[PDB]
Design a binder for this molecule. Structure first.
Ligand SMILES: [Cl-]
Ligand SMILES: [Cl-]
Ligand SMILES: [Cl-]
Ligand SMILES: [Cl-]
Ligand SMILES: [Cl-]
Ligand SMILES: [Mg+2]
Ligand SMILES: [Mg+2]
Ligand SMILES: [Mg+2]
Ligand SMILES: [Mg+2]
Length: 263
């Protein structure tokens, strides 16, 4: 809706940074609204949904087991690993790692899951195979959050990842059990949801994954809608701002508020 565009613009002005935005109709994939939809932005932790989609694809193919136990060590622990730092001695199952990676944004969990699939190049190969010609993962956590000027590594476009999320959450790319598991992880309550959950009406569904990185990178991908069912995909990215984190979050939240008001 045009009013959302005005709010995207206002976010660019307040943040001193580009903002990319797309809304899709979930059933048809039709583009309902867009701003900078084909420009590149860092994925940051929004990639963790794509990662878990690749894991679940392997589960469906009999190449992985959700119950397989992954053992790791102290040196594997990187910053912002609130779940994995509690399981050095006992390990975590693949299922537990995907829950941590998505709901808690656990960085080491994502790195371990990347090992399970064979690394960033294998994620990127999966994405290419499902028809995403843009998204690329090059590095693991935390270095993928760098947000360096002029660096194409670890980027997507709003348009690409919106279509990829639609492929993962609907249709037959994943089995029903795996689709539902991915949605369950994305819907699970989290500690703080400033970007959209904070705008979402009661009784609406949201399955979301946020991201935050260096150099102003911030983003969210989501399927949301009224009446306990998703009906749209929304993707919002920004990078480059040096405004406070609170200001970044507020500006993106106001985009969400507008989307909901003018739904
Ligand atoms: Cl545009
Ligand atoms: Cl564009
Ligand atoms: Cl730089
Ligand atoms: Cl959030
Ligand atoms: Cl700050
Ligand atoms: Mg200003
Ligand atoms: Mg060990
Ligand atoms: Mg191309
Ligand atoms: Mg809740």
């Amino acid at each position: 809706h045009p009013e959302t565009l005005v709010k995207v613009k206002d976010a660019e002005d307040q943040l001193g940074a580009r903002v990319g935005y797309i809304e899709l109709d979930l059933n048809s994939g039709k583009i309902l609204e867009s701003f900078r939809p084909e420009e590149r932005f860092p994925l940051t932790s929004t990639f963790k949904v794509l990662l878990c989609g690749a894991v679940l694809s392997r589960v469906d193919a009999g190449q992985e087991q959700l119950g397989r136990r992954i053992h790791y060590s102290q040196n594997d622990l990187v910053e912002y690993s609130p779940v994995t730092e509690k399981h050095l001695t006992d390990g975590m199952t693949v299922r537990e790692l995907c829950s941590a990676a998505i709901t808690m944004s656990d960085n080491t969990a994502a790195n371990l899951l990347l090992t399970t699939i064979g690394g960033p190049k294998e994620l990127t190969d999966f994405l290419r195979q499902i028809g995403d010609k843009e998204t690329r993962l090059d590095r693991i956590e935390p270095d993928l959050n760098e947000g360096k000027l002029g660096d194409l590594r670890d980027t997507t476009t709003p348009k690409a990842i919106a279509s990829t999320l639609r492929k993962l959450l609907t249709g037959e790319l994943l089995t029903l059990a795996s689709r539902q598991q991915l949605i369950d992880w994305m819907e699970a309550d989290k500690v703080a949801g400033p970007l959209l959950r904070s705008a979402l009406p009661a009784g609406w569904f949201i399955a979301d994954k946020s991201g935050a990185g260096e150099r102003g990178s911030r983003g969210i991908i989501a399927a949301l809608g009224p009446d306990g069912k998703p009906s749209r995909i929304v993707v919002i990215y920004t990078t480059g701002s040096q405004a406070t984190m609170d200001e970044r979050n507020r500006q993106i939240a106001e985009i969400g508020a507008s989307l909901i008001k003018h739904w």
